[PDB]
Amino acid sequence: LNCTASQFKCASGDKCIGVTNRCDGVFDCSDNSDEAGCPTRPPGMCHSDEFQCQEDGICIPNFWECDGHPDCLYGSDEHNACVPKTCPS
Incomplete structure (x- = not known):
């Protein structure tokens, strides 16, 4: 059976970690599928938000x-x- 959308279904399928932990810098589940798709893209230039x-x-x-x-x-x-x-005000 599947899991909630909030629970990012890892490509391994072993653990259905939450999307909050998807690309969170932590290898929550196997194969690091949560962190594999991290679009940091710092080509010597900081991210747009930073x-x-x-x-x-x-x-x-x-x-x-x-x-x-x-x-x-x-x-x-x-x-x-x-x-x-x-x-200031």
Whole structure:
């Protein structure tokens, strides 16, 4: 018998782990079918959701960009070109 859609049916079929553990960085079931299809695709550039810092390229969440805090090595996340409004209220 099958399992719920929330339970990712592993290609092995041994364990029907949840989709929350599908591509979660953890080999939950056999053959790593949960993590086999991980579309990280970092071709030297960070993922779309993660801002790539200018000086070093270290990936940070895009929310950290122009967040009022120099998360970057040189604060390129708070780059002068941004001029964010960043209303405290």
